[PDB]
Amino acid sequence: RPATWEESEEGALSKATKYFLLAEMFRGLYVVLEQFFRAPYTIYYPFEKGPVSPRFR
Amino acid sequence: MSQVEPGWHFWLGYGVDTAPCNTPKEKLPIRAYPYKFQPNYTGTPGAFVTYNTLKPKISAWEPVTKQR
Ligand SMILES: CCCCCCCCCCCCCCCCCC(=O)OC[C@H](COP(=O)(O)OCCN)OC(=O)CCCCCCCCCCCCCCCCC
Numbered sequence: 001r002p003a004t005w006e007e008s009e010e011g012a013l014s015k016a017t018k019y020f021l022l023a024e025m026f027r028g029l030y031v032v033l034e035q036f037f038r039a040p041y042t043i044y045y046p047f048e049k050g051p052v053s054p055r056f057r
Numbered sequence: 058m059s060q061v062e063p064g065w066h067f068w069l070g071y072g073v074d075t076a077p078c079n080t081p082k083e084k085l086p087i088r089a090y091p092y093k094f095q096p097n098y099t100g101t102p103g104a105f106v107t108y109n110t111l112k113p114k115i116s117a118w119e120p121v122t123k124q125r
Contacts, residue, residue, distance in 0.1 A: 046058040052070030
């Protein structure tokens with residue numbers, strides 16, 4: 001059975017902190033920002049070329 | 058990209074480890090004709106003109122008169 005509000009482990013104040021300060025949204029923003037400092041994947045066609053195999057058609 | 062010679066085109070694509078100049082003589086095609094490289098000529102007067110390589114299926118009669 002789904003639990004009711006009164007049987008919740010977290011206090012209302014902590015839940016309200018997460019609610020008003022957008023905790024998971026800031027976690028998402030941080031994960032996005034981490035990509036900004038990684039090596040990109042692009043290659044510079046037509047000066048470079050993607051992989052080609054003997055079987056290519 | 059059409060100006061890359063064949064063989065180098067494959068190397069640049071990571072097709073092979075060894076560049077064309079470094080390949081042994083055994084693994085080079087033998088040619089009985091002169092080798093000529095020509096890139097893509099589209100948008101130029103050198104573009105390919107296709108045509109039918111066969112003469113027509115049915116050959117008409119060459120008219121000749123005879124005297125009665
Ligand atoms: C604990 C005591 C606190 C006392 C009061 C606190 C004072 C004010 C607190 C400051 C922040 C208040 C403004 C944001 C409050 C967020 C409330 C919220 O979550 O909105 C929920 C809303 C749907 O409403 P609801 O039905 O209640 O959600 C339950 C759904 N089952 O659905 C939504 O609208 C989603 C939330 C909207 C978020 C907008 C995001 C757009 C921009 C992102 C901002 C992030 C910062 C960006 C800056 C870059 C980072 C450096």
